[PDB]
Amino acid sequence: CSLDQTVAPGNLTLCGNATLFTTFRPKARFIAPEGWMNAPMGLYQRADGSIHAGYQSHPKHIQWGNISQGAAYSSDFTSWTDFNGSEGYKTIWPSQIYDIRGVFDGSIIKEGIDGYPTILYTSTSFGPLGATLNEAEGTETQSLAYTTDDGASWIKLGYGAGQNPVIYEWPETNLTGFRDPYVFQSPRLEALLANTTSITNATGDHFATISGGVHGDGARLFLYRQHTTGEFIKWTYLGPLVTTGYKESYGEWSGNYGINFETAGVTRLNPAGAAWDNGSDTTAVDFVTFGTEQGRADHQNHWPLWAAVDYEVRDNGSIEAVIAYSGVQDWGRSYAYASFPVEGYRQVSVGWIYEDDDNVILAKQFGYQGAFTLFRDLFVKVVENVSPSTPGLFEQASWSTKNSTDGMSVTVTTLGQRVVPETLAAYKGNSTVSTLAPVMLNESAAAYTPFSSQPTDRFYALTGSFEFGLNTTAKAGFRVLASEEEYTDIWFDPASENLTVVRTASSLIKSFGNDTELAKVKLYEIVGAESKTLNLTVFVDGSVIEIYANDEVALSTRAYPWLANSTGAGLLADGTTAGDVVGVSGLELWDGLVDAWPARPANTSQGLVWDGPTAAMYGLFAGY
Amino acid sequence: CSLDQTVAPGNLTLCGNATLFTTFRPKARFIAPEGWMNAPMGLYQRADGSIHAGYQSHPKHIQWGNISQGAAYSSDFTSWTDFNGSEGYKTIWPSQIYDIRGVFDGSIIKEGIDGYPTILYTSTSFGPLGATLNEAEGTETQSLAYTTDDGASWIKLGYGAGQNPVIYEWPETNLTGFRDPYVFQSPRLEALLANTTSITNATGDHFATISGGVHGDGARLFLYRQHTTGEFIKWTYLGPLVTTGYKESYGEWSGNYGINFETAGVTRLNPAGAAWDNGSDTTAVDFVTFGTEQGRADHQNHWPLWAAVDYEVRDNGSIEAVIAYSGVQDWGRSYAYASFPVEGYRQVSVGWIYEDDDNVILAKQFGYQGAFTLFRDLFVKVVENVSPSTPGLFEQASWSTKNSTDGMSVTVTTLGQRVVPETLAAYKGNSTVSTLAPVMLNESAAAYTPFSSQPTDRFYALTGSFEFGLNTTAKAGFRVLASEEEYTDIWFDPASENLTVVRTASSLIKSFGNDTELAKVKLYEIVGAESKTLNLTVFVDGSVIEIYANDEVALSTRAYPWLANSTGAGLLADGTTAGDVVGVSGLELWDGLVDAWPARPANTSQGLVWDGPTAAMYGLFAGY
Ligand SMILES: *[C@@H]1O[C@H](CO)[C@@H](O[C@@H]2O[C@H](CO)[C@@H](O[C@@H]3O[C@H](CO[C@H]4O[C@H](CO[C@H]5O[C@H](CO)[C@@H](O)[C@H](O)[C@@H]5O[C@H]5O[C@H](CO)[C@@H](O)[C@H](O)[C@@H]5O)[C@@H](O)[C@H](O[C@H]5O[C@H](CO)[C@@H](O)[C@H](O)[C@@H]5O)[C@@H]4O)[C@@H](O)[C@H](O[C@H]4O[C@H](CO)[C@@H](O)[C@H](O)[C@@H]4O[C@H]4O[C@H](CO)[C@@H](O)[C@H](O)[C@@H]4O[C@H]4O[C@H](CO)[C@@H](O)[C@H](O)[C@@H]4O)[C@@H]3O)[C@H](O)[C@H]2NC(C)=O)[C@H](O)[C@H]1NC(C)=O
Ligand SMILES: *[C@@H]1O[C@H](CO)[C@@H](O[C@@H]2O[C@H](CO)[C@@H](O[C@@H]3O[C@H](CO[C@H]4O[C@H](CO[C@H]5O[C@H](CO)[C@@H](O)[C@H](O)[C@@H]5O[C@H]5O[C@H](CO)[C@@H](O)[C@H](O)[C@@H]5O)[C@@H](O)[C@H](O[C@H]5O[C@H](CO)[C@@H](O)[C@H](O)[C@@H]5O)[C@@H]4O)[C@@H](O)[C@H](O[C@H]4O[C@H](CO)[C@@H](O)[C@H](O)[C@@H]4O[C@H]4O[C@H](CO)[C@@H](O)[C@H](O)[C@@H]4O[C@H]4O[C@H](CO)[C@@H](O)[C@H](O)[C@@H]4O)[C@@H]3O)[C@H](O)[C@H]2NC(C)=O)[C@H](O)[C@H]1NC(C)=O
Ligand SMILES: *[C@@H]1O[C@H](CO)[C@@H](O[C@@H]2O[C@H](CO)[C@@H](O[C@@H]3O[C@H](CO[C@H]4O[C@H](CO)[C@@H](O)[C@H](O[C@H]5O[C@H](CO)[C@@H](O)[C@H](O)[C@@H]5O)[C@@H]4O)[C@@H](O)[C@H](O[C@H]4O[C@H](CO)[C@@H](O)[C@H](O)[C@@H]4O[C@H]4O[C@H](CO)[C@@H](O)[C@H](O)[C@@H]4O)[C@@H]3O)[C@H](O)[C@H]2NC(C)=O)[C@H](O)[C@H]1NC(C)=O
Ligand SMILES: *[C@@H]1O[C@H](CO)[C@@H](O[C@@H]2O[C@H](CO)[C@@H](O[C@@H]3O[C@H](CO[C@H]4O[C@H](CO)[C@@H](O)[C@H](O[C@H]5O[C@H](CO)[C@@H](O)[C@H](O)[C@@H]5O)[C@@H]4O)[C@@H](O)[C@H](O[C@H]4O[C@H](CO)[C@@H](O)[C@H](O)[C@@H]4O[C@H]4O[C@H](CO)[C@@H](O)[C@H](O)[C@@H]4O)[C@@H]3O)[C@H](O)[C@H]2NC(C)=O)[C@H](O)[C@H]1NC(C)=O
Ligand SMILES: OC[C@H]1O[C@@](CO)(O[C@H]2O[C@H](CO)[C@@H](O)[C@H](O)[C@H]2O)[C@@H](O)[C@@H]1O
Ligand SMILES: OC[C@H]1O[C@@](CO)(O[C@H]2O[C@H](CO)[C@@H](O)[C@H](O)[C@H]2O)[C@@H](O)[C@@H]1O
Ligand SMILES: OC[C@H]1O[C@@](CO)(O[C@H]2O[C@H](CO)[C@@H](O)[C@H](O)[C@H]2O)[C@@H](O)[C@@H]1O
Ligand SMILES: OC[C@H]1O[C@@](CO)(O[C@H]2O[C@H](CO)[C@@H](O)[C@H](O)[C@H]2O)[C@@H](O)[C@@H]1O
Ligand SMILES: *[C@@H]1O[C@H](CO)[C@@H](O)[C@H](O)[C@H]1NC(C)=O
Ligand SMILES: *[C@@H]1O[C@H](CO)[C@@H](O)[C@H](O)[C@H]1NC(C)=O
Ligand SMILES: *[C@@H]1O[C@H](CO)[C@@H](O)[C@H](O)[C@H]1NC(C)=O
Ligand SMILES: *[C@@H]1O[C@H](CO)[C@@H](O)[C@H](O)[C@H]1NC(C)=O
Ligand SMILES: *[C@@H]1O[C@H](CO)[C@@H](O)[C@H](O)[C@H]1NC(C)=O
Ligand SMILES: *[C@@H]1O[C@H](CO)[C@@H](O)[C@H](O)[C@H]1NC(C)=O
Ligand SMILES: *[C@@H]1O[C@H](CO)[C@@H](O)[C@H](O)[C@H]1NC(C)=O
Ligand SMILES: *[C@@H]1O[C@H](CO)[C@@H](O)[C@H](O)[C@H]1NC(C)=O
Ligand SMILES: *[C@@H]1O[C@H](CO)[C@@H](O)[C@H](O)[C@H]1NC(C)=O
Ligand SMILES: *[C@@H]1O[C@H](CO)[C@@H](O)[C@H](O)[C@H]1NC(C)=O
């Protein structure tokens, strides 16, 4: 095993465990110290204003298993510190018959048991578990734990009658899944159900959804309500909140609803951020965010989706969330988005970016798998004065339209997503910032034009506004992680409405994924404008490439170039002519970003271990 | 629920939990503070000379489940003190994927991990488990833990490759069971295998048996040897030590070998006690003690047996233990005998006495189930100058015979068992002792003759020597726990060689067992004697009746008389005439015995709990 990054890569499968630990590793984002991570969990803003973030964790392994909560905290979403206790950076782990198979995703009741922050989580035990298997009741249940030390440790309720697990009965038969409880307060839902509480007797101020589905008959999000305020054992099943069909799709802008939901959450937003009104704010919109399984040919069969919903009250004192329009939260290699409230009327969302090594060829050599996305403020994106001649506008696919009285303009409403400003400020302020001169891309434009300033490593951000003619057939974007032999091309093609990431040349290492990523982006044309604009922000962080368009569209992906000098960046142009011109302005390079884990040394590997021959006997975890 | 013990019992199933806690409860023996117990485990003499005793335990329940090690200690086998830690009187409990289904029986390596006492125990996980079920590999494995604080707590080795569990591969396919590791040193076995260690490479100073069997083909005791002295991870399978047939029986004196072994141990004894020679002591005998399953119509399908064995060395460097003769360790409601070495060349054995409430009618009202037997010294019983005309003598069923050179007398050899002298001394010294005048039972004898002194409660011992004519047809023995309406009759009938406990009148409460207990007792007739003698010792301790004959035969059983005055005792006589006389001498009553748990209050119940609806979902434990 040679680690010479000035020559072509050898056979890297001969390299030892964690020998490639720093080679492709993100530095500017949330990631475990080592080993396996997946879904964010247990997210809450603590009493001191800091953010507690948990995550599904399997230390000293590079596949999933013994799944536990790892945790850390931050005062600004950006610079983090690990918890360190008797189990290292873990704070909840399998320990009881009811959760021994894994401590799955959970969410926080901020004033819970004895007034302490309390997690409701999926506690798993033995038996077939999965949407394509024949799971039985009891394999997935829901349990409580609380913390008296602000998340350094958690105390589980005892096992037994009237204690853990607190939710165990399946609400319908033949579930595909029964997990990922999302606890939330909702003046909106309380107002809607206030006339029906005699029917159900459930009058608590907390609701909880549980994600799943029914075999052969599509996904389900099940709604529960806390039975009595200030009491946390009894949760009353109201009914299905969201019901979708077996592999139903709302269309090209909306992914596919698959067979089973995961990590679903419920929020209410307005143009400024989170909305906590009872229905009285006419600018507020109810949203559900959710993952779907088995409705996708690639990306681990996983779509992270969202839908705007209109709530209807059923006669049995339950709620139907009728989907009004439906979109995609991220179009790339990310999943398991969790959202949580943050003071100042914010709802903040973060997901998990998996690697692109699905055959597990270099995972041991990495010594880790996975990272988070950046933390994102959610809000209602409102575009005013939209031209009715915007192509495809009245499809109303992942947005809504409201005509002006005179019919000459439209107001467009959709889900907005933008990187939390704390992170943008810290990134910019800690970087070497190069403000770049505008560039007109015309007949003289090369295919690739390097920026006048270049990055110095694999940790940078780019911003640009691309102004296109209304009938352009030109393409433009950014090339990143670029040398002559390796590069990753981010293209937007207004004629097809497709944002793509072409990765055929991303790396000389052939075992990594190289498929083309794709997102749909609607450029809403403004009344009286003779052009249309794409605002693109791109973060390059080790192997992560995370793309944001117009505070709306997100696409996370991976690139693993071998060569030390595959760090360059610049502009891409295709079909730009004297007459079909692309004006690029607002160009900025931020070189360096932030060291997100200042207390950690560069190499936080502790080695990898094998569970031994019993792993195959038990059949629950891969074992490595 | 009335607790009036001066009138007939009402419907006691209406009584609350633990309302009958003290009513039938032993006071003078090892018993858990409350709840469920079964097999002794983890027995060893500590560095300070005290005895550590563990037991299979399920606190606050009255059926088996979450099976854990409860523990206590004693300096004299007799007066005990509970450990008290973070889990009360438990010291090992289910906590890892490999043992979450139960911490089953285990035994002690005295100088183990880092020089500390170390337990090798059966760690159980999910799946069908049982001799009549289709168990698979991995469900039962063997794991290590060690103590740095003399048994107050135990630290398990980590889960994984080269750590726990340390034995997981089945030595043959289709096992009926794979548990109860018994670790022991043996100069005998080391000497026998010394010429074969090249074949196996196993040269350690510890051996371990694991108890089981093969479906359809009888029980098996599997022998392992520690691979290297001072190292405790690697244990090498040598071969089957004991192989018996599917429900094979050696005869009327030997129970039945069933389909599966449990709690098996290996020892070597001589007339004085434990023998630690390499084979050079010609008075020493190799013994195996073991439980069998599914070879008995009653007594929970369980026989606690023993066999004298002759070891043969196989060509593959393993040992066959050929059964020379075979007996019964206890003929009544006891099982799961464990033996352990004690300083002064002793081997001490103790078992578990279950209740006689197999339909679980009053278990909740008790608030506990189970106790230990008394602790017993094992030795080789040798009877010299035995008459060749002793009936059935050359059957050599559970004994061996050696003729004198002239053929006029025989030396008989069998397993001896006697209550440890520490307990006999303490019992006698703390009791009110009444030495009773001898009684000739003849034509004038009533059926029942009360002793001249009577017990004052349900805690007493009786001794007597019954001298019978060589051709008697008379019966005699002891009645205990006796009033006019309730009593338990212990009879010996020399003509049939049967010791019986008749329990048709033991209690007015009809839900308890009332079947007749039976043991075979061989009165070895001495050359020149014109009579034959039965030395009977009986312990009455709450509901326990524990009978010892001639330091050889043991029979433990249960009686639950309701009436407060059903405490009396005396002599039984049947068919005694002027010519067929039974001379009773050495009669002594010890009233009171010892308070075995002086620190415990009378009622150590902490209530009972239910595991809730998930107990049936998981399907592992009853839940109560
Ligand atoms: C199979 O058997 C298993 C083993 O038995 C069993 O698991 C065990 O289950 C039991 C019962 O559910 C659990 O017991 C609970 O423990 C909770 C605390 O748990 C935390 O702390 C313990 C112990 O703490 C110490 O010991 C460890 C180990 O040495 C040290 O690390 C610590 O530093 C600490 O040491 C100090 O204290 C020691 C003595 O205790 C000293 O020796 C020492 O010197 C130190 O000073 C830990 O062991 C726990 O760790 C385990 O669990 C965590 C997850 O929780 C894991 O991460 C970890 O790996 C371990 O597995 C843990 O950290 C108790 O809170 C709980 O007590 C209450 O509940 C019951 C009711 O259910 C009540 O009886 C009792 O009164 C308590 O409730 C009161 O208090 C709470 C708030 O504090 C109130 O909400 C409640 O209403 C009530 O209030 C009362 O008082 C008020 C007045 O103040 C009054 O106003 C109220 O009205 C009311 O009266 C309970 O004891 C036990 O932890 C499990 N153990 C393990 C190892 O798993 C398993 O379930 C079984 N399985 C099956 C299938 O049956
Ligand atoms: C799923 O995830 C699960 C959770 O991660 C996982 O279970 C965990 O597995 C790990 C790894 O196997 C276990 O870690 C081991 O822990 C052993 C000690 O265990 C005992 O102590 C711990 C911790 O102790 C404290 O914390 C608790 C909780 O707060 C307190 O109650 C205590 O008071 C104590 O607190 C003090 O210390 C704290 C910090 O640690 C402070 O915060 C605090 O202020 C106090 O000061 C307990 O948690 C354990 O309890 C659990 O387990 C018991 C059974 O064991 C249960 O009954 C109980 O309910 C709990 O479940 C327990 O009591 C360590 O000994 C062990 O460390 C060694 O082994 C590894 C190799 O495997 C080495 O890396 C390491 O060096 C250690 O080995 C050295 O030491 C030993 C002798 O001491 C030598 O034999 C050895 O050779 C070596 O010697 C070295 O040093 C020598 C020089 O001195 C040198 O000469 C030698 O050459 C050599 O270098 C390991 O850390 C962990 O306990 C599990 N946790 C739980 C909760 O289960 C599970 O397996 C996962 N499942 C799957 C399927 O993957
Ligand atoms: C005295 O000790 C006991 C512990 O032994 C304490 O706890 C009680 O324990 C018993 C079991 O011994 C439990 O009985 C079982 O109850 C099941 C239904 O329970 C529900 O209804 C009752 C009645 O109002 C409620 O009290 C329960 O509420 C509690 O539990 C829920 C969780 O479900 C919590 O949310 C609450 O907060 C409470 O904690 C329940 O809502 C019942 O199904 C079960 O069924 C069988 O057993 C009986 C008797 O043998 C049969 O008649 C019946 O046919 C069922 O038999 C089964 O038997 C075999 C083998 O098991 C199976 O193969 C069959 O298919 C069949 O299913 C049983 O009756 C009791 O619920 C529980 N009480 C609790 C926790 O409060 C007592 O509390 C304690 N008392 C005191 C004063 O301390
Ligand atoms: C680097 O990290 C790893 C952790 O990832 C550390 O531990 C090693 O981990 C790997 C797995 O990543 C283990 O590989 C597996 O080994 C199995 C056979 O092992 C035995 O032989 C080896 C070789 O001499 C010994 O080292 C082992 O000894 C250790 O374990 C025993 C317990 O058994 C202990 O007693 C010892 O003390 C040691 O701790 C063993 O004796 C092997 O069966 C297993 O098989 C598959 O995997 C490969 C690769 O994918 C395939 O070629 C093969 O076909 C098998 O594939 C399976 O794949 C699928 C899915 O799993 C199944 O469906 C198939 O049916 C099929 O079974 C694998 O190769 C390795 O043993 C282990 N080493 C240890 C513990 O020492 C490294 O130590 C660490 N390195 C350093 C320097 O720190
Ligand atoms: O770590 C479990 C956690 O991850 C999610 C989201 O991806 O589920 C994954 O893990 C399950 C258990 O292996 C799989 O069945 C599932 O297909 C997979 O997506 C959460 O739903 C869960 O809490
Ligand atoms: O934030 C104002 C308002 O919202 C409520 C809704 O019941 O609480 C939400 O907002 C808090 C601040 O972000 C969160 O801590 C809380 O978890 C969330 O439910 C009100 O309590 C509050 O007055
Ligand atoms: O507590 C388990 C312990 O008891 C024994 C001896 O009786 O086994 C009993 O428990 C097993 C598990 O429920 C049963 O399969 C078995 O039939 C029963 O005798 C020990 O062998 C075991 O270690
Ligand atoms: O007891 C004398 C002699 O026996 C050995 C056998 O190797 O140890 C046994 O006896 C000890 C005392 O009862 C026990 O502690 C020990 O566990 C048992 O193997 C010798 O070590 C000792 O010299
Ligand atoms: C980058 O490195 C490779 C190999 O060292 C080299 O061929 C190339 O010229 C270098 N510089 C570039 C592409 O600017
Ligand atoms: C309420 O009605 C809906 C629609 O019929 C149904 O799915 C749900 O199960 C009902 N709730 C109950 C039975 O609690
Ligand atoms: C919205 O405006 C477009 C263009 O003016 C028109 O085609 C459509 O009918 C209008 N819809 C409504 C509801 O008025
Ligand atoms: C650098 O980053 C840190 C950590 O997020 C942040 O607190 C600090 O303000 C940043 N420095 C700037 C903006 O100059
Ligand atoms: C653009 O995207 C869609 C997928 O939504 C695809 O079917 C179409 O072929 C793409 N067109 C071009 C020109 O890339
Ligand atoms: C024992 O008690 C019962 C009921 O109180 C009574 O009938 C009997 O006479 C008492 N005394 C005896 C049997 O000596
Ligand atoms: C040794 O021989 C015996 C008798 O053939 C056999 O049962 C045992 O399995 C053998 N040991 C091995 C293969 O280790
Ligand atoms: C043992 O003694 C009896 C009676 O003297 C006799 O029947 C038998 O043959 C003797 N056995 C041997 C081996 O001498
Ligand atoms: C009473 O019993 C205790 C506890 O076993 C014992 O130590 C003491 O010697 C006994 N008293 C006597 C024999 O007088
Ligand atoms: C004595 O015991 C045996 C069982 O070993 C039995 O078959 C026989 O009938 C009994 N005989 C008498 C008279 O009790």
Side-chain angles (χ1 to χ4, degrees), chain A residues 66 86-87 90 93, chain B residues 93 96-97 114 146 154-156 158-159 163:
Chain A
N66 197 31
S86 58
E87 300 303 319
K90 285 180 178 188
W93 45 84
Chain B
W93 45 84
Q96 292 281 317
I97 193 60
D114 297 339
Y146 66 97
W154 301 79
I155 300 168
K156 295 172 189 178
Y159 173 59
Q163 309 173 91

Side-chain angles (χ1 to χ4, degrees), chain A residues 98 126 159 161 610-611 614 618, chain B residues 98 126 159-161 610-611 614 618:
Chain A
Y98 62 88
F126 205 80
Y159 173 59
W610 182 42
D611 288 356
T614 61
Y618 306 146
Chain B
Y98 62 88
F126 205 80
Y159 173 59
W610 182 42
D611 288 356
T614 61
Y618 306 146

Side-chain angles (χ1 to χ4, degrees), chain B residues 384-426:
Chain B
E384 269 152 27
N385 301 127
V386 176
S387 166
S389 72
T390 300
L393 186 64
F394 296 98
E395 290 170 17
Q396 295 192 69
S398 56
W399 61 88
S400 185
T401 54
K402 189 175 204 288
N403 288 13
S404 57
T405 308
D406 72 0
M408 298 304 296
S409 62
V410 178
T411 303
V412 169
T413 295
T414 192
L415 182 63
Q417 296 184 267
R418 62 197 168 217
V419 173
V420 295
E422 294 90 341
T423 296
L424 295 181

